[PDB]
Each structure stands twice: as C-alpha cells, then as structure tokens.
Amino acid sequence: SQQQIAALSESLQATQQQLQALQQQCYELEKTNRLLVSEVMTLQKMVKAQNQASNEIINHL
Amino acid sequence: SQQQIAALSESLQATQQQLQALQQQCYELEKTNRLLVSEVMTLQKMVKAQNQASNEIINHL
Amino acid sequence: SQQQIAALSESLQATQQQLQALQQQCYELEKTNRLLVSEVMTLQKMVKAQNQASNEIINHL
Amino acid sequence: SQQQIAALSESLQATQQQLQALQQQCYELEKTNRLLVSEVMTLQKMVKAQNQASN
DSSP states (O other): HHHHHHHHHHHHHHHHHHHHHHHHHHHHHHOOOOOHHHHHHHHHHHHHHHHHHHHHHHHHO | OOHHHHHHHHHHHHHHHHHHHHHHHHHHHHHHHHHHHHHHHHHHHHHHHHHHHHHHHHOOO | HHHHHOOOOOOOHHHHHHHHHHHHHHHHHHHHHHHHHEEEEHHHHHHHHHHHHHHHHHHHO | OHHHHHHHHHHHHHHHHHHHHHHHHHHHHHHHHHHHHHHHHHHHHHHHHHHHHHH
C-alpha cells in the first residue's frame, strides 16, 4: 500500500509537470494568435483604405 | 495512510483547476479563430469588388 | 478508506474527462486553422490579381 | 486494494499520454499560427504596393 501510493504520487508529479509543459505551449499559442489578430486587423484597415482609393479612381475616370 | 492519500487528492484538485483554466484559454482561442474566419472572408469580398472596379476601368476606358 | 481511494478514482476519471474536453477544443482549433490557411491563400490570389489589374491600368496610362 | 491502485496507475499513465498528445496538438497549432502571421504580413506588403499603384 504505502509503496504503491508513493509511486502514484511520483506519477501525479510527472502529470503536473506535463501540464506545466502544456500551459507553456498554450501561452506561446496564445501569443501568436494575438499577434495574428493584430495583423489581420491591420490588414483590414489597409484593404479598407484601398477600397476608398479604388472608388476615387472610379469617380475620376 | 490517510494523510498521504488526502494529499494525492488535494493535488488532484489543483490539477483539475489548471485544466479548467486551460479550457477557458482554449475557448477564447476558438472564438478568436471564428472571428478571424469572418474577417478574412470579408477581405475576400472587398478585394473581389476592387478587382471588378479595376476591370471596368480596363474594359471600357 | 477503500473510500478515500474510490474518491480519488472518481476524481482522476473527471480529470481524464476534462482532458478529453480540451482535446475536443483543440480539434475545433485545428478545423478553423485549416479554414484560415485555405482562405488566406485564396485572399493572396485575389490580391495578386488586383496587382495585375493595377499594372494593366498603369500600362494603358 | 492493490487492484484499485493498479487501475489508478493504469489511469495516470493514460492521462500523461493524453497530455503528451495535447502538447503535440498545441505545437502544430502554433506552427500554423506562425505561418498565418507570415502570410498576413505578406498580404500587407502587397496591399501597400497596391496603394502605390493606386497613386
């Protein structure tokens, strides 16, 4: 019993360590996804601006 | 004995909590991806429109 | 205290289930990433096509 | 029970395996996000160039 339960605690420690590794990964995933949001929103602005530039061309044909 | 096994459990509470935290993080990433999809589809639509306006210039003029 | 250990088993089952829920979330992120990869590549095509349309205008000026 | 505790161990190993699988998934998701960030930045460069052609 005591020995089996010590090994269960060794095994739960390694699980907690695996979860720490996963949280780390998830932070990095979030970082990049946040960045992507910010870049896509920048693109949106630039494409919008291009709409207006296009229309102006049309209207001065 | 009972103390060792209570700790096996009180550690498991903290693990479960961490997992809940990770599920929340991942939900927010799921949301953000859905939003990105929408943005990108609309950019397509705007660029398409700009291409049409361009072509009209090319064709008639 | 077979009792304590039954509750630990109840508890590790729920954790495993939390992990399954998180894997489900990650599948959903994969799906939408795949959509994004595709759609962003389509947007790149369209924006290129715009660039060609632009140039043609320039040449006819 | 020795048996109950062997099944706990069977279960903790599978959890550790699940966590490894999830780490792999999240790696691949991050790779794809990096690719997307690159491609969106290339799209920005192209749209800027379009602005200059517009001008």
